Structures are given as structure tokens and as C-alpha cells.
Structure 1
Amino acid sequence: MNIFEMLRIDEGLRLKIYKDTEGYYTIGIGHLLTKSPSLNAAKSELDKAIGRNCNGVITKDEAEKLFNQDVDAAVRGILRNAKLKPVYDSLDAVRRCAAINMVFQMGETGVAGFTNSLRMLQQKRWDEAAVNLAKSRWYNQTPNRAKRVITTFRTGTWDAYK
């Protein structure tokens, strides 16, 4: 397993504009287009991202290229963030994937409230970090996704995805 297979399982694949769990227009493998309620704004964001007039539909190749850019962007966001990079560098390869997964879903700002979890992860207090991560809006709104990611942090294995 690797980060691309993990996120493909968590996000699925849809080739037409859809709404995510929060109601935001999204396409492909979890690519957020806009938080605006306007479908026309979302369609404009899509055409800009793809470079052609899509009318709300993309190919599988396009979805996979967007996904590669989005994973790249998540990793770059971790590496440029002075709070996240030291924690990321302390983790093994499997747990790094759980870290990217959370940034992909919530962004650098969505993880800003997780200061206490980050310290426990850096100290390798896995069970304690798992409990702290579950005390969140994230866990309460998307519990199955959160359980898979938390289990990955707790165990350092892919067992939640097998």
C-alpha cells in the first residue's frame, strides 16, 4: 500500500461534479472545486484546473493527474509548515501516509486545532494520540474515515485498509 492507494480508497472516484460530505462541489478523487454554493462557479474552477471546457465532466486520466497534483500539494504544505514538518520527519513511512491523508482532507488550517495530538505523535505515544484524535469534530462527522486513519497512526500498519 501507498498514499495514492490509501486516498483512492478513502475518497473514491467520480468523473462528474458531486458534493462532498460538507456539501461542497468536488470532482475526481476528492478534488475540492469551491466552497461557493454556485454550480457555475464550480464549473469555472473545473475548466481552469483542467485547461479545457469540461461542462462538469472529466476523464479518468484527468482525475488521476489532478490527484497527483493534490497529493504533491499536501506533502509540500507539510514540509513548508514549521509546526508540521518536525512531526512528519519523526514518523515512519506508514504513519507519514496517515499524516498526508489528514492534510489532504482538512488542509493545514483544519489541522491547526490538533496541537496536542501532534505533540503526542512526536513523542510516539500512540494510544494517547489515538484517543486525543478521536475527540474532534473530524471523528464525529466522518467516523469511519477517521477510524481508519487513527488506526494507522496507532499501529503503524495497513490493517485498517486490508
Structure 2
Amino acid sequence: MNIFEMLRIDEGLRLKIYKDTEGYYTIGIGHLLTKSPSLNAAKSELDKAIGRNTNGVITKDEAEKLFNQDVDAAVRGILRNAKLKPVYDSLDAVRRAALINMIFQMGETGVAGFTNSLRMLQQKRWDEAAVNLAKSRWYNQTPNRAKRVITTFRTGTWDAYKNL
């Protein structure tokens, strides 16, 4: 268990281009390709990102490389966000992955809005943070995933991912 496996499970890994919920071309582990409605355009973007003429199809390895790039971007983002940096800075390794998981799902700005829960996490008030997060829209919208992430924050272990 590592971040890649965690996200592969939570977000799912797609080897072919598809449309996200906002109707935007995406691939791999939730990797947004473009907001253009043009598939050719998405295809061009994809080849660039993968560094291969893929004709809209990628390998798991290529998805992982892609994923790493996103993680890196997420980390740089966190590091320039006054609401997230302090929490991230305080978190142990597994909890960091749980936070990055959230960013993958909702975007940095969206995660940064969980003001109170973030504070609790920074304070190491695990159960309190868990209870607070269980009240969220996010929890009620994608409960299975949210519950896994929450359990990860509560325990600091990968326990929620052991038997899926």
C-alpha cells in the first residue's frame, strides 16, 4: 500500500480517454486532459503528457507516471496554499496521502474549504476530525471513498484499504 494504490482504488484507473463528471476529457487516475469538447484536442494533449503517440490508449505504467506528476503538482500547490500547508506540514506520511487523495477528488480549493476539519487534523484531533468530516457534503456524496479516507485520517494506517 502506497498513494498510487490508494488512488487507483478510490479514483479508479482508466486506460482509455473518457469524459469526467463535468464532461471533460480525462484519462488514468482522474487526469484531466483538456476542457475542450474536441477529442482530437484531448488526444493531442494526451500524447504530449505520455510522451508517446497513444491514439487515446495508455498502459498502467504510463498511468502511474502520469499520476506521479499529478501528485507532484498537488504537493507544489499545497505548498503555496496558506490553508493547506500548515496541515500537510504537520501530518505523518499516511495522513498526507489521505489529504492528497481529497485534492485529487475535489481540487485544492475545494479541500482548502474544510476549514474546521483541517484545523482538527493539524491539532491531531483524529476522532473529532472524523466526526466533523462525516457531516460533509463530500461524505454524503461519495460515502465509500470518504469513509476510507476518513478512517485513514482517524488511524494513521492503511487499514481501510486492506480488504476491498
TM-score category by the smaller chain? 0.7 to 0.9
Deviation at 1:18, TM superposition (A): 1.9
Label 1:128 to 1:17 Cα distance change in 2 as closer, same or farther (>3 A).
same
Indicate the percent of aligned positions where both proteins have the same amino acid. 98
Deviates more, 1:29-38 or 1:140-149: 29-38
SS in 2 for 1:111: helix
Supply the distance in 2 between the matched residues of 1:157 and 1:143 (Cα, whole angstroms): 19
Deviates more, 1:37-46 or 1:5-14: 37-46
Supply the distance in 2 between the matched residues of 1:106 and 1:35 (Cα, whole angstroms): 16
Supply the distance in 2 between the matched residues of 1:112 and 1:90 (Cα, whole angstroms): 15
**Cα deviation per residue 1:35-56 (whole Å; 9 max; x = unaligned)?**
4444344333323323444332
Please report the RMSD computed on the Cα atoms of aligned residues, expressed in angstroms.
2.0
Label 1:85 to 1:50 Cα distance change in 2 as closer, same or farther (>3 A).
same
Deviates more, 1:142-151 or 1:35-44: 35-44
Q: How many residues align?
A: 162
Q: State TM-score, norm by structure 1.
A: 0.86
SS in 2 for 1:57: coil
1:43 corresponds in structure 2 to: 43
SS in 2 for 1:58: coil
- 8 A Cα contact 2:4 2:64, kept in partner: no
Deviation at 1:94, TM superposition (A): 1.6
Deviates more, 1:103-112 or 1:38-47: 38-47
Supply the distance in 2 between the matched residues of 1:3 and 1:109 (Cα, whole angstroms): 21
* 2:129 aligned with 1:117: no
Deviation at 1:130, TM superposition (A): 1.3
Structure 1 unaligned runs (5+)?
Answer: none
Label 1:153 to 1:25 Cα distance change in 2 as closer, same or farther (>3 A).
same
Supply the distance in 2 between the matched residues of 1:132 and 1:23 (Cα, whole angstroms): 31
Supply the distance in 2 between the matched residues of 1:5 and 1:53 (Cα, whole angstroms): 26
Deviation at 1:141, TM superposition (A): 2.1
Q: State TM-score, norm by structure 2.
A: 0.85
Structure 2 unaligned runs (5+)?
Answer: none
SS in 2 for 1:27: strand
